[PDB]
Amino acid sequence: PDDWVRVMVSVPAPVDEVWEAVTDPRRVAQWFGHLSAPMTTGASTRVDFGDGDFFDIEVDHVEPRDRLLFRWSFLGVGPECQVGWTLTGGAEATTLTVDDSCPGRPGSEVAQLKAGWLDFVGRLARYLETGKPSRYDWRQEIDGSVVLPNGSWHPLREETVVDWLPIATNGAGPGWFFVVDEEGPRRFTLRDWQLDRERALTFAVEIPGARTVTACQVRTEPGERGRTLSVSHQGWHRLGLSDLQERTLRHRFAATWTAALSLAEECAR
Ligand SMILES: [Cl-]
Ligand SMILES: [Cl-]
Ligand SMILES: [Cl-]
Ligand SMILES: [Mg+2]
Ligand code: NA
Structure with a gap:
């Protein structure tokens, strides 16, 4: 389902x-x-x-x-x-x-x-x-989704992930995740890459200065309406950094994931 x-x-x-x-x-x-x-x-x-x-x-x-x-x-x-x-x-x-x-x-x-x-x-x-504001200031986790056509291109293949994710290899296997905007850092270390072809992708992104790593999960779910590509990127609230540093990272990575989901939609066209 309801x-x-x-x-x-x-x-x-x-x-x-x-x-x-x-x-x-x-x-x-x-x-x-x-x-x-x-x-x-x-x-x-x-x-x-x-x-x-x-x-x-x-x-x-x-x-x-x-x-x-x-x-x-x-x-x-x-x-x-x-x-x-x-x-x-x-x-x-x-x-x-x-x-x-x-x-x-x-x-x-x-x-x-x-x-x-x-x-x-x-x-x-x-x-x-x-009468006082009750807004939250920033949400501790990033998520998003986009519905893709049930076509031949799929986002979760070793040979397609570079088509839509902001990643590059570091020897052999993805090793960097990039946030390209007017702020810094731009280059982040990517660890623990695990791709289950056309099912799920997990990896960690290290944050300079932080007490723990962030955790990313990407999945596709098939449906009559199309394939739903979803992302979850967690950990921003447990980095042990200043609140403004944590918030700024969360905001910048959210914009990055928004761009990635859009690019996946373009690739699937
Ligand atoms: Cl693969
Ligand atoms: Cl799927
Ligand atoms: Cl928590
Ligand atoms: Mg909380
Ligand atoms: Na807060």
Whole structure:
């Protein structure tokens, strides 16, 4: 499987207050993320979390003090999800119901997505209670996905990984991972490369100065809709570096993975 995530929160605020909190961009930025423009019927917008993560949004309907219906794509490359935020007033509280569906969603994604929406509605409730910002500053793990056609090119082959990953060999076997932007470091040591052809890829990326290594898992899951290529890159919060160093690394690597997923989509065309 059931791709349809449904989450609810009940808050002791009136419907009009909750509606403002989920539509006014100044308020939305206190608990959810930064909107490039308010949601408007038939118009596109974008929400940015300040850490490299974002969704591109197309808004289908805005019904005041009732509901928001929109579609979005994680990092601009993920499959389109149908999202609904619906308010129901009560004698005790206002209920916000979140619907998030996506045809063919891997069952492996559903639990993470439910937890993600429970986090977001928990931040809404905190902001309504205290008036203080309840945003997270940066998310401790990187993830993303893109749906590829069921074609002849596959991203998880020794002879295709260099087509889309920012890696180079170091003797014989991938040994460097590159983050190419206007900051540094640019070159990172890659260790423990393990490729299970057309199934899964794991490796570690060392961070200069850090107390532990980061861990990367790439997988493909077949489906009627196409092959879902997914990445998880973890460890940023346990590097033993300053928070700004950890956040900056996470942000830069998130942009790198966004570019890699896009390139894989181009290769699979
Ligand atoms: Cl292989
Ligand atoms: Cl596959
Ligand atoms: Cl942890
Ligand atoms: Mg944590
Ligand atoms: Na934090």
